[model samples]
Target: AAHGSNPEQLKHCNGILKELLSKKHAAYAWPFYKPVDASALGLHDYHDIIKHPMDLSTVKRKMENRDYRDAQEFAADVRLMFSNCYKYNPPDHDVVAMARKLQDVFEFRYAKMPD
Candidate 1:
């Protein structure tokens, strides 16, 4: 199914992610990184990668809709899955603990927003 209609639609995105990961990495350490150039470093020169370039059009539509909602929903699932870990469980926090912690600390907050 389509993850989103507009670039900002993300209601089912998380559910899809959890389904995919729970099936694929059921018992392995996970390091998920989607590299987006947001600093305009010399190594990243693409215009699209120019780190938060201000465009009123994108700003106008930039609500916590697509990626944000997907992230939030996926994060909630991580919390739930971790909280349910048990000794007898086939696989335990050996894989997902760090991810859970990172989300709890780093990725949970909003950065500066455009007005």
Candidate 2:
């Protein structure tokens, strides 16, 4: 039997995200707070590199829409956003560095969840 989409898992996922979105240096949150604006940033080739664009706001939207089946799927979506970061930005740049921190926060907290 494939057990999936339980409310308890959704609650746990919500709890993990609540603390993360509240972290300080949220200005570091600048880059990922919303979807990347390719035109404004002059990153027209962004899609060529990162086809599956994702962001924190979108993640929040997905949660509201009940898109994830559980914490595992939720975590995957989180990581996918970071992966896109890596694909489009230099690791040594401020954007990637901050994203790495965000990713670490998610990993550590998600680790404690009952995946």
Candidate 3:
């Protein structure tokens, strides 16, 4: 059963990404889209908007701390979701391949793994 009234809002997260990728929008090719309005818009109530799932703040925090392993784990989390999304919804194959590229970023960042 649906827990939140706006559970569908979570679905909109991917749409936001898709919109940013559209040619009609100036945000095309931007590195990321911070879900929190204040984080992306530089407005007030920053903390109010900070708790959304997939906010990327945790990812930013890890990067700032140079915790590459943590960042890779975050990437793995996203890959798992996107892989499932692709399996169920079927985005272009290239988008799925790019997810691997994202995983590679974490691998390259954390290359000193134990042999």
Candidate 4:
């Protein structure tokens, strides 16, 4: 327990990873598939607005590295990815719309997973 992977937690983490990659969320996934490029897009104050940037690629990398302690950590970053969208983008923006849609799917599945 001190310095190793927990079997149940590891399994749950993998399940959440699959959910993030699955086709059900594919349509809304593109915009967030990568980390935001403030330099290329020239989004002023992007770093100032979104403090903790998170994305699917980062999430997947963390999962592969086994950095996540459990499902909650996995879900936290997923939600962070969306909330960053909400913080930086307008409510009516298409990215926000996608984040909201994607949020529903993740939340729905997350709630069903054991605590």
Candidate 5:
């Protein structure tokens, strides 16, 4: 079943995230790094990735139709939209490595895990 038609039903989403962060990363010690340009590694020739902005009207309409049953499901749908509808291609090894590092931090900090 859909989570709810009303977006207000997601009010508890923040609390859920807060609880997870507090429980999982209470001792996270990773240091932040300054942003670096991909062009620094001779990636200046790469074409800019294109993407269409999400249409919130359609999204809200879907939600109002009870397409999402809960905040968790709703959030997944939102992610799926970006992951599927956006103009994208698989990243090369360099980009993948950086992303993998971030994933590792999250996984290491929060053991076990959820899909």
Candidate 6:
């Protein structure tokens, strides 16, 4: 759900990491689309045209307080959780679509993950 948009947007959007982590549902439930105006753009809301599920809260909080962790740590967690979804099957489509979306996000960010 998170990997369906532009990567550059994710990196620049503010509070996005926090919101992604703070949200409990799949992602469609969140209001993470672009801001209503340009004045609301910057480190927190510059890229407002992106929509995806993210759970970087642990790191989000850490970075908020000047505390940071190896990107690998968070990336690994992302892979594990993102690929672990199951159940609630529907006759409409396969679950792999979800996995692929997660992988897209993983690949995009993992490549940029700081050592």
The candidate scoring highest on lDDT is 4
Report every candidate's CA lDDT: 0.35, 0.81, 0.40, 0.82, 0.40, 0.40
Indicate the residue-level lDDT of 30 in model 4: 76
Give the residue spans of candidate 1 off by over 4 A: 1-70, 86-115
Over 11-82, each residue of candidate 4 has an lDDT whose tens digit, in order, gives 766786677778877898778888999989899789999999999889999988988876667878998999
Candidate 5's displacement at residue 77, Å, is 1.2
Model 3 reaches what TM-score against the true structure?
0.30
| Prediction 6 TM-score vs. true | 0.36
Model 5 agreement with the true structure over 1-115: per-residue lDDT tens digits: 6434334545443333343234353333111122223377454533354232232344455555766566656555434333432234366534344434434553343332332
Q: Please write out the lDDT profile of model 2 over residues 8-79, one tens digit for every residue.
A: 777878877766677563756657778999999999899999979888888889999988777778888888
lDDT for 66 in candidate 3 is 47
lDDT of 1 by residue, 40-81 (tens): 534344344332232212212333234344445434444433
Winner by TM-score: 2
Clashes of each: 0, 0, 0, 0, 4, 4
lDDT of 5: 0.40
TM value for model 2: 0.88
lDDT of 3: 0.40
Looking at candidate 6, what is the lDDT of residue 109? 48
List candidate 5 segments past 4 Å from native: 1-55, 85-115
- Residues 4-111, candidate 6: write the lDDT tens digits: 333434343323344344444355312222222335533344234323333344345545664324343445544543433222223333444654554565466456
Residue 25, candidate 6: Cα error in Å is 14
lDDT tens digits, residues 1-115, model 3? 4335232333333233343345544332222334334446554653443333342344445444645343234445444433442453236655455445543543443343322
Q: Residue 26 of candidate 2: its Cα lDDT?
A: 75
